[model samples]
Target: GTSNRDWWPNQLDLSILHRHSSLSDPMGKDFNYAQAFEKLDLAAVKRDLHALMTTSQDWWPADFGHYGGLFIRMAWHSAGTYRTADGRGGAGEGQQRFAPLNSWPDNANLDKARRLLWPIKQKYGRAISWADLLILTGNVALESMGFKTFGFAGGRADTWEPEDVYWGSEKIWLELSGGPNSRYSGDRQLENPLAAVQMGLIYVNPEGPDGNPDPVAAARDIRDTFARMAMNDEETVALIAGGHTFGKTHGAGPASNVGAEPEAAGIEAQGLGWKSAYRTGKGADAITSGLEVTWTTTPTQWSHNFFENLFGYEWELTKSPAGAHQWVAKGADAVIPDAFDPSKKHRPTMLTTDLSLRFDPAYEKISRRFHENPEQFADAFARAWFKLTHRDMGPRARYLGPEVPAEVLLWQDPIPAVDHPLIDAADAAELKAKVLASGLTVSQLVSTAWAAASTFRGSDKRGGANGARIRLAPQKDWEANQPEQLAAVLETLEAIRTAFNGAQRGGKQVSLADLIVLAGCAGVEQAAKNAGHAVTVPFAPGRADASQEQTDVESMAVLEPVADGFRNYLKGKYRVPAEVLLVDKAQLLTLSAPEMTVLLGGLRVLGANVGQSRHGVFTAREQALTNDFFVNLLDMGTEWKPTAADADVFEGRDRATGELKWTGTRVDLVFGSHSQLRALAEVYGSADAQEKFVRDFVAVWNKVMNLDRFDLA
Candidate 1:
């Protein structure tokens, strides 16, 4: 059957966008799709973003201060401008790049956030839009901090200055309302009293007329601002609480100085021209009110600590030297102890809006609910954050392609079935007891089973049971049919038969063919698991024993020195064409392209090599199932040597390390040489694709083990 993309036009175009092309014009210059909707390697992008969030010295020790919260805030503010009723402004236009939206006073100091992302955009180029990157960066940041967000996809395109320009209507709103400077009527000491409580409105002035907090005004302001973006009371609470999980307030003290110090020089180096006074001392005006202070004791981790601290501790309004009104611990002992340290005092500073969540009746219940149940908060926040980021974009907000499910994108492990009914444990145990009672080890039984199954592939190309049965029968002419190793496998089967005294016969009886097949399945499953791979090989009963029949030398001749897909059995006696050796192996084994690729990877991990074969060379770590085989094959760090006469066979050697790694069979080389096969190979090769590789390998392996079992449903 064709893939789902065959009949679906949307699926087809999306699939094509993932493909890498090298076609050129007659003049020998590259010609590619300019507006082709190129898909970014989202998994790689997520990985890069996570690394930046957690490791980069710019946000190091992740425990103290990190940009993850700021990244989310930046993303939030960028999209928060959307007025869903009119569909005028939102993240869709990437309007944060231009003036008005970019220069909005509420978005003060966010140029640093955009600058932090510029290098990533340069690396990824036009495939990733600024709109998508902003949302994705925030999503990755949240997930990295141990919180979940709704899945992401990427279709958002970069908007030009013309497209992002503030329209006439928005201009009126900006000028008339004073934008972030908007406030209620009064001769207030501070410019914007509503901004005092709102964390997102950090730069807005907090002082009211009497210098006293007004919970009603703060709550109303939140509804007014959030309702414009189509967010309700619950979403408003989750978004604000979740966003406040990491960052601390600026203008607090020297401890909150982000770009002033040499070590924290990211803002200054990016040429974001903000004065050092805003970051250092008691802030710009020495108001000493809205100085730097963490919102939660656990500043780095994503938790409901903000709410916990909000409800648990006592807070008092204080003016920073910079003249901003923010809350501080009411007393030295009034501060909550650090979650990480009981003895150390860790007071959390709250914005006026945060305090309103407790004081305002409409928002108090949700705040208390989240403070009590962190998991519930995480879930609500995840949904709300999705809405916040996806505002006005519709389906165009996908961070990865549509084909990848949300679970996979979030790195959730798949749940596997409990049992496989194919193998009868009682029958297997009885056979094992018989074999053991006859002085044969389980290892011998396994080896013999694999050997017997190996011969099932014959010159007839039917891939039937004829070869195993012919090789199993006892006779003088068949003596040459068995090598010492092959003879041992038959000896074990024969020993089990003698021990059973013909009791194991008929309908209830286990056939030698079935035992061999079962043993092979068991061996592969065990090998895979032992190599740290999670695999399940399905088993099915009911393979009939070959009737007690004699065989002629002519028939036995074809079965001797069995031809296998993995190795060139005849070697010097008969030369197999390199190309034939590659694809023919899978054909002979009746394995699909992906199946063969996975099986070979598993074989390499298990160190399951045919006698003196040179194909399985993925890693030096013996008996470790991993994606190294695929990874090593595609890695440019290793030099691949082609055969002197044939380009099909290759050898892998690490150039920098000076290590002769492994040789590739023609079949193995074809995975890298063929375009379609290479795509599957690259998927299996990715660092994050290990679980899927193991899963697909197990499914295909079960199919291979059951090839001759026509009785299986």
Candidate 2:
């Protein structure tokens, strides 16, 4: 917040001192000499540059380069801004960090290189200067990775703050550099750095409210902001025109471009890109004259190549027929004249409208919310760009001062580079050192070790699938006393678990059937009943099925009392102090208090029939078993009552109302619980629930077949 320092235009502030006081020492000399050549170690730099070029060519999406060479194009624009006509601004070699330069679209990804060099900056102290380090690193990285030599300088100073740097667009508009729109004039024919800066800014912020810049408004803004920034008329015109050299204006929306010309046969039918222009309110054959103006003869250099293309010259450098035809008009005097003479004028290349490259809908929405205010747009764009570009200096990169070992110096030493054979070992050693220095627990050390191992393992994909396990919890009142029963149930459940594990160990692939069997076995064990005997009641999947059932309201009323009889038995009979005789279906089923209690308790504990499907259709097997179970509950001498409340029913009239309904004709004798019965009825609709019911029903049958401890015969 304290800013009383004099603002020099792109000049180093004497108040800010460099870390290396004088370039006399060996390190200082190396720094100075390196600064002269942008501080790049030529051999390593060239090696990396080659590698990067080759690697970048392999990038997907047609591999012109990653993100369509956006990064490289961005770098050119960014670097070019700092490079003047005579190279006065080139890299500064270090002054690239100042505004108007740092804000270039091509420079957006420079944060990448900055991140790579961050540690170096910290090690050499705050005074070491990012301005010098970043540009140097970028030059080194490009050369080292097989990119073309990017000229860089070293003495340039970093802007103290972003505010100090000019946004360039404003600079050229006022004729400070020359004049607003002056750079675009054919006489000057030079691309405006200021315009490049503005275009780059727009490119970087395509999603910006002003990103789809209006040419007329842009011209006006350039004139206005340029005048304010001290540009003379010529410079403003040249700069504004220079911007147009690399850019073109597209009408807003498809309807605007495609107004009412006759559709070009299949071209319109096939949805050709140009036809889309017709939809934009422009005639189908909308006049396009800007194509040849931007193409450079080489198409490789950064400067006026765009202007050359726009100026109608041989575009043989790169051939984009459709692009050329679209941007270049058919007439001789067209802005970009399309020539059948390929040698005379190269095919004009149009910037294809890549949907992927278009602003995201969410971003478009946000832009619309703030489009009314240009200041707000600028502020938002600046904030977002800063957030996106700011590199996080991780713990490993923090400054430990000059006394620290050179190995710890960032940008100088490798931090476990991917090619390092002993990178894992190095990481382990680092972790060990950190662990020893800090009084951490054994678990922390182990976790750190695990993290290291996990990183090394990466996504090797050698994992195997495992079966799902059942979870059990005791009922509310008897939770403490039921540990024995819970254990018995858990043991049976473990056996079911073992079945799947055994298959996996045997190298057999598990399937849906396996899961069903497992759930079935676990359910029988938990409820302690032959699930085959359980009964099913029907209810709507939502509420529809309940409304559609054939059983009448009066029939339901008759059945209600009988359903309640079994419901009372399930509620009051099991796990009691005294004996209770249980009967079902107007018949007395033989039962000793102890035997009946064990049967019911076992069913409650081990045999739970959950209808797995949600579609409201139980499989015959589960339905049959459930039917038997319900019959037993009904036979237990308890009265049967309708489980659901009638429209006119009063509170507490039927205890089993709402959820405890067991109205289905099929019943299972094995499982007996209001919850289990209701679950079977409700989940019967789903295929998954039906499958589960069948599996559970089968497992309950198997357990019953195996039971030697029971007396019933």
Candidate 3:
């Protein structure tokens, strides 16, 4: 029998003396943990959004009627359904994607908003979560309107089904009875502040006391509702006021005396109408409910005006013919026309909740402070808005600072024209003519040129005077060159040269090397653009041609190692270990950590495969010039494991999706695992910092092309 002491050995014995005993008892197998978490570049997403909402004029009412306001409403309603107690509903699960919630009457007109975002969803669906997109749109919309809002992070997963029905009845009743409609039967009766307060509370506990019975008790409901969502009184006030900044009360209620005809008004007219109805003066027609009114004077802009007008104006209770009760200004300043109209003046409006900020002693001070200071209100609102949207997201929600820069939010550039500068217009035209005459498509010519240029790197090969001409010299016995592939490319090159020379009457002979470089650059740029990336691969002419003596068979054989600086095929052996491959590859190329990472990312985007190496870095959108290589490398959701058949090659698996895919070499993995390299990877991986990737890639490509040229400046 084994003794307890023998079974559980002491620390020193377990370390060394008892090692053999532990082996006989059996040991644990090696295991790999989940990969690290990688965040989406919030900045890049913001830039893409900027181009769509502010720059792209594709949607309706193009000029003064941007869909930014509607987007805000969509985000708000999507997240507003959160019930904090059990965390059943909220943007976290993207529940708005489903039935009853999508068609909820309170969300009327929002279907249009969702449809407008379809294009964006189509393009970036893989990287961005639906919940994150919903919240991001709202934040971006505010920024586009010249308002400052908090930044956001993405980790929310899409929900496939609706939540539990414990609080369904109250939720439906709360949404239906609130807004322009009221359940309490009365004439010209103001909206109950308690009703607004109860809307915030019922999700917390349906059976709890209703705010309707009393005022002091109603204040408890407001506090309790917000408290459950982790919001304070200050945040609640800010969120309510901020949301009212845009959007208007629409439609005549069942109780309204006014007919069902709705009064639709622009941001400017609505703000003015509300202000006009509140003061002590003119038009009696304006003092009726269902009269469209805006929350702020600068209706399209985000500011403290909502709170400012609430505290400054006097409101009178009025009911629309449709029976909806609202407050309107009663003074000489009455409702104004559109901003484009000749006669337009500032005006304001109020809702019962807006009135509550003034009537409720507990909430009055906070409202007054916000009214006094616009900056303070903006800050408060940003924080509160973030809290409201992420209320039920748990640990997945994150705040990044300023989704987009202030300057970018106001970009006014028109759609850009496509321009290719690598090959001069005349040269490109001539090349096209020659390709057409040869019965080969321009695409085929470009493809061949690209393949030739890709062979420039190999084991111990460095960039310099070694251009495309090397493929032509001693072309018969070059082992590194794929004979069939090179034969096709060389034939295209000859055709282009012949046509180009014929067009010129013995002017300085065009260098085949220069043409190859230019053609390759043009091909890459065009391909990248077609793949939805607008990148410019820089070109500098001045490459000297290889002499006839340099094209001899003996000279060409030296360059045929079948390996390059970026990768090592190890003489066609598939068993090459990744560690050995990286060392040989990096040593041959003399690349810095950052330079190596950038080259790999660029190659991946181009779909360039060397030595049968297929990495998951660019699997999703392989052609797009994005920071995904770094993103996937750093994503904690992916784990690395060696193949069961062969330990030489490693693959990555997405823990979330259970999807397995090929992974990059050890050198590439180091960029994500090593501290110093990881920092550089982060910078290049940033959504906001893509320009850096473009700039650096061109520099590296240029450097690779000129690696062997000692004569260059």
Candidate 4:
């Protein structure tokens, strides 16, 4: 537990800007997961996984003599961290193998679940990723236990240990974080990004908020937590009812008698943690979460017992042997069989979260409805499980496997496949020429293009210009895109699209998706031309346009930019400053510091500020792609000072006359203030750096535009 938390902000760690910049990858530069996955014997992997699920070992005994429940729980914990907000935490990277996630309290004792698969992993070698194995085993477990899966997609690649992901939310509570009730909340309010403001667990406390076991209150917490992850009430109900239908909550002994977490465990224990002091700890005596209870009679098989028992009897709050609050069905006696002894049976039990589905009116109705329609319940659970695992896998295009589903859902963010021939180098040149001749300014073109691609998060590989979603409802109406202006620009571009396609013969048509991106590429070239340089910005045209019906408005809402530092839009700060926000945006865009530096200078010089704010627009020569923004920014003749109106705002004045020359937000001045950024700023600010700025900006812009090209990959 060297660093149990992610909040050490004494000084901003600039290392985080390039945190995942791959200082060095253990797999190195050439290893591609998609290709490796293509080579994998997926059937062989699944067969071996199925075999492992039933053949239990003495080291850790499986409940009902089957490892299905443990594997399901392990797989669930692995993918359940992805909240729609920024899409950071997901199983796509095999992140559960590393720190913080590996050591999380709710993730307790799941190390053994992964350990059981080590033999299979070693057998498969590099062809299958730990990421793929973690998820695929869950799918295998589901099918082996007679539950159907929608499908499996096995292209999840492993990543190096993550940096700059916040896993701690400062749990200022009565508990000191080591006991059974370590899941405490002195403050109920949570950070919007959380879905992990408290990192360890994904669901609201199973025992209830801070272990009170209140049903309606638990429903509120559950709804809030699950909704952030983009799960609606029906999916939420099925997930709870379906998932609890299989596994037993482990709490045979008190957590006080258990050992430390994996990271903090003794060296002698190898990589394992949470050794128990109780008798026969390996088998029936094991204490994983200290809230022991099995829900279904056939825990090994897929059954409807969770709802059958939940609605069938009255339940009263009770304590597990491990001293955590759980529930026992009042009238149901000896209904569920024991893990080790088949002859022994115990009364059915439920977690506070399980009871929540019955007590909360909406969930109660959904649960009862699911109970009535078995096929509906099965399908819903299958979809929810599929999404839970694959939510952050970019798009279905990136999926690599034999088990891919035929149906495309809105959550997949599907872009229709290109039917016509794509534009070549020669065709692109003429199109770019026509777009530049079109009425949109370089600022308007670049801003619209950037807005479309602004949703590019390198972590999840979601959002970019490839879908042309910016013209659709949720994104089209998003305020950050400057909606009304965006509508006008989109109309202009669509007209350009119509004329170009109408003029074409033999179906050599262009899409609005391709045109908008081509417009920005053309705009950059024109700006560079005005700067007295003749350079071509790269344009690859095969993008597809999405309709309003195709775009999920509620889901897309999470991608809204409340405070985009790139657009110079400060939607009012919240203790977090604009400069810090920009670096985060820069990293999320996967822009290297040098790339970010040139991009900012180019955008500012092009006058692409939100609502046309003058801040950071240092060039006297506007709409030209010169290094003037950097050059003027570093001018020694100017002295920067806080403006009388706002401290967050700065006014740079002429050194001799003290006349205001330029205005800046913290994001603008940060280039001069930070040593690392200043170094990059210096490179572009040099007297001979004008041409260098144009080339770098174009290259970086191209990179960002293609970030969501799961289509390309």
Task: List lDDT for all candidates, in order.
Answer: 0.55, 0.28, 0.52, 0.84
Model 1 TM-score (2 dp) = 0.44
TM-score leader: 4
lDDT of 4: 0.84
In model 4, state the lDDT of residue 8: 53
Query: Residue-wise lDDT of candidate 3 within 1-713, one digit each (tens)?
Result: 89745865421111111122324422233311111113455577777776667543332222134456667877877776654333345676676765555544355435446666778777765457677788888988889888877656455554445542223224333443334434223532222112223332222221123313232333455565555454678987887788778745443233222211112224543212222223221122222224345566665676666776776677776544444444666562744334234356535656554666666788888878888887888888887787677655432112223342232110111111112223455665455445445654334434344344443332212222333455555542344444665576667766777767666642533456666666656655654565566766665554544444434343233334344424323345433344344433443344555676677666665555432356534457654555677777777888887677655456788887869755655545656765655787888878786667766866676665555443332
**lDDT per residue, candidate 4, 541-614, as tens digits?**
77897777878888888888887878788776676677777877888898778988898888888867889899
Residue 196 in candidate 2, Cα distance off native in Å? 8.8
- The segments of candidate 1 whose C-alpha lies over 4 angstroms from its true place after superposition are 1-38, 56-65, 162-212, 253-271, 277-291, 332-346, 395-713
Candidate 3 TM-score, true structure as reference: 0.41
Runs of candidate 3 exceeding 4 Å displacement: 1-44, 54-64, 170-224, 252-291, 332-346, 396-713
Q: Which stretches of model 2 miss by more than 4 angstroms? A: 1-40, 57-63, 66-76, 79-90, 93-163, 166-326, 329-347, 350-713
- Find the 10 residues in a row with the least total lDDT in model 1: 409-418
Q: Candidate 3 local accuracy as lDDT?
A: 0.52
How well does candidate 1 score on lDDT at residue 542? 55
TM-scores for every predicted model: 0.44, 0.23, 0.41, 0.96
lDDT of 2 by residue, 69-164 (tens): 223333333333322111123323343454444434234333333433444454454344454454334444333323333133233334343322
RMSD of 1: 25.1
